Structure 1
């Protein structure tokens, strides 16, 4: 067993769940890689279509886990399911998840996501089964329905849409966008950047694929959808599906005149969902924002919107030296405005104080019922005001459980066009 202590409350939790971890963290007894973005390349099956002795053990492990979860280990259905998966692999080199296994797998991938502060909600995930999809047009239909369901007029609901699994790696379904809704970024003639600098490369691909850019600071990017390994196709999300919040400040009347807004729905679409050896390379999932994701990182990273400049100017702060803390002061105001604006418009949002408090409660629940909760301190602690949130003083153990969400290469690095 391993213990974790909270240094504010002195609560000690005892971890045994880590004994079920399967993948390497990247660390060793001599080096810790906890701050590395992608510490490990340890995967569960090789880089493409596995042989039977590579895939079946991963399948059996997950089927065993699912049937244990419902108190039916060794039951009739469990043993038939194993025989069924065996035959499927014998005749197709893969197998197909039942609807129940798919739902279980998706929820537990979220439950196992050690970087996610939002996991107290993990069992409240709506799962849309899109495994019958065959074209990029059908992918667009599924994504539109997902966006409409999840947005729900501002009462946001967590959802995931799961497209057909990888087969031989030449027929991948992929959403090329990193999120379903993101703003364009444009390389300016003088050298600067208009819009979101994170998306300049993706923006140029879209233009390179025929997208006519309106060239503004908040241009919603088109969807770039790839189905069955074919070349990707551009689609415009209907604007009535894209809920946006104008950013205003409860005290500063001039804040409105900054002309800022942001979208309500955070929807990650470039990760990979791994269940029992199966790789779902297109599995867009969405929830609701923690305010700091917009106000600290989107607006105030140097390589992003970088608006600390303007806000501090309008505030008449002394930007002559760092020790006036003008950056910190403007940072707080911007995050006040983001929360005030979303709350005013009745769009679901959580502040980092509430979110981190929820996560401590979630940790305690998971230790009580599951014997552990894998958690990545570097990612869980908010990017501002860390030490005045309870997670700062909370020791955490990070380990990798399956099913899981994984990073995957950007498809433009790997796709050979037609």
Structure 2
């Protein structure tokens, strides 16, 4: 069964066959769509089918499907599974797995770059300190003095679920958030809870509006430990506006490296619970969400005020006006400092080209419209008029509960 998607701007129609190779479920049914819902201990019983499926994919990709190399590997993995209840990936497989996980990430507008991922194998890691070291090197390598590089670092796979490696931070680099007694928040409101945990674990908070948080690292199921990323590793960009001289005085800055660390990499049934990955920012991530979202730095008011906008009725679109300027300034600041950033126009255009290419060479490209469309100026980007099929392919990045809700504390 074949499926068509249409771009209503350009009348380009594409045909998806890839969706047939889909395994996992969407949350949707015939009678309900959960397409806008944010979120919708594994035995050998179901592991080898997952392994075989991955290995079949892998050897297809290297044009060795059915080869003796393919069959022995299957045999080898089989034997290792029933013998050890799990199995290990070769380096080639791990790299393939991680790259395809990204490629399969249907909510990611950035997947044009997916084949150019730097994979760091941290599967020999055994301690938090070792994790800290691997992560430091990730950051230094990925940051590259502002010339950002995609990278992922992969810590040991889950075994019995009782010896998990986890990075407790949601991102490697993020600013603290402090609930004040008067109800106001100092720093990033998105990070208040994690900040508290860190503090409780013994972090000494400078309590400034832009304190880089400590890494909280958990190895082999042990209680997590605190580490401070060396500040010379944390590339930061002061935020100024090209026409508005008063913008710098808003005292804003942001870090250059977006590196997500709370997700789970699944490859051939194996679960990599600590697998931090990084790329570079689309400007709107910082400029729309990180600053202007009501539950974040929320500087919309202050910028509006300083622009002397009509902030009385909303129909003055003062919010819209400030939002643009703030995103103008974010892009301006980063480019001025030669730190890699992409604007939402460029990123969405690239994605459409990626997607079309993917339909031609791969038979489809799973995509989550709700997430792919930029959080501002949606319809003047070409993804807005792009119909998209959303389905779940493995290898995949998955969500997982915050470790502090599941962790058993040693003490």
Common topology (TM > 0.5): yes
Distance in 1 of aligned mates of 2:116 and 2:139: 17
Of the structure 1 ranges 69-78 and 385-394, higher mean CA displacement relative to structure 2 is found in 69-78
Note if 1:237 corresponds to 2:226. Answer: no
Q: State the Cα distance separating 1:371 from its structure 2 match.
A: 0.7
Q: Could you tell me which residue of structure 1 aligns to residue 141 of structure 2?
A: 149
Alignment of 1:16-165 (within 5 A): 16-37=17-38, 49-165=41-157
Cα displacement (A) at 1:163: 0.2
The offset of 1:362, in angstroms, is 0.3
How far apart in 1 are the matches of 2:192 and 2:52?
43
| 1:161 shift after superposition | 0.2
Other structure's SS at 1:181 match: coil
Superimposed CA distance per residue, residues 353-408 of structure 1 (whole angstroms, 9 cap, x where no aligned partner): 00000000001100110010000000000000001000000000000000000000
Task: Tell me how far apart the structure 2 counterparts of residues 164 and 274 of structure 1 sit (CA, whole Å).
Answer: 12
CA distance in 2, matches of 1:265, 1:179: 10
How far apart are 1:80 and its partner, in Å? 0.7
SS at match of 2:266: strand
Where in structure 1 are there 5+ consecutive unaligned residues? 38-48
Secondary structure, counterpart of 1:127 in structure 2: strand
- Once the two structures are superposed, what CA deviation does each residue of 1:60-96 show, in whole Å capped at 9, x if it has no partner? 1111110111111111111110111011112211000
Count of residues paired in the alignment: 407
* Runs of 4+ more than 2 Å apart: 49-53
In structure 2, how many angstroms separate the alpha carbons of the residues matched to 1:318 and 1:72? 65
Kept in 2, the 8 Å contact 1:275–1:403? The answer is yes
Q: Is the 8 Å Cα contact of residues 50 and 93 (structure 1) preserved in structure 2? A: no
What is the SS of the residue equivalent to 2:359?
Answer: helix
Equivalent-residue separation in structure 1 for 2:184 and 2:400 (angstroms): 30
Q: TM-score, normalised by structure 1?
A: 0.97
Length-normalised TM-score, structure 2: 0.98
Q: CA deviation at 1:190?
A: 0.9
Contact 1:3/1:12 (8 A) holds in 2: yes
Q: Please, what is the CA RMSD of the aligned residues?
A: 0.6
CA contact 1:107–1:125 (8 Å) conserved in 2: yes
Between the aligned partners of 1:88 and 1:151, the Cα distance in structure 2 is 38
Give the secondary structure class of the aligned counterpart of 1:391: coil
CA displacement 1:328-365 (0-9 Å, x = unmatched): 00000000000000000000000000000000000110
Shift of 1:53: 2.5
Instruction: Return the alpha-carbon distance in structure 1 between the equivalents of residues 234 and 99 of structure 2.
Output: 25
Distance in 2 separating the partners of 1:182 and 1:118 = 21
**CA-to-partner distance for each residue in 1:174-206, whole Å, 9 max, x for gaps?**
000000000000011211110000100000000
**Secondary structure, in 3 states, of the residue corresponding to 2:248?**
helix
Structure 1 range deviating more: 200-209 or 53-62: 53-62
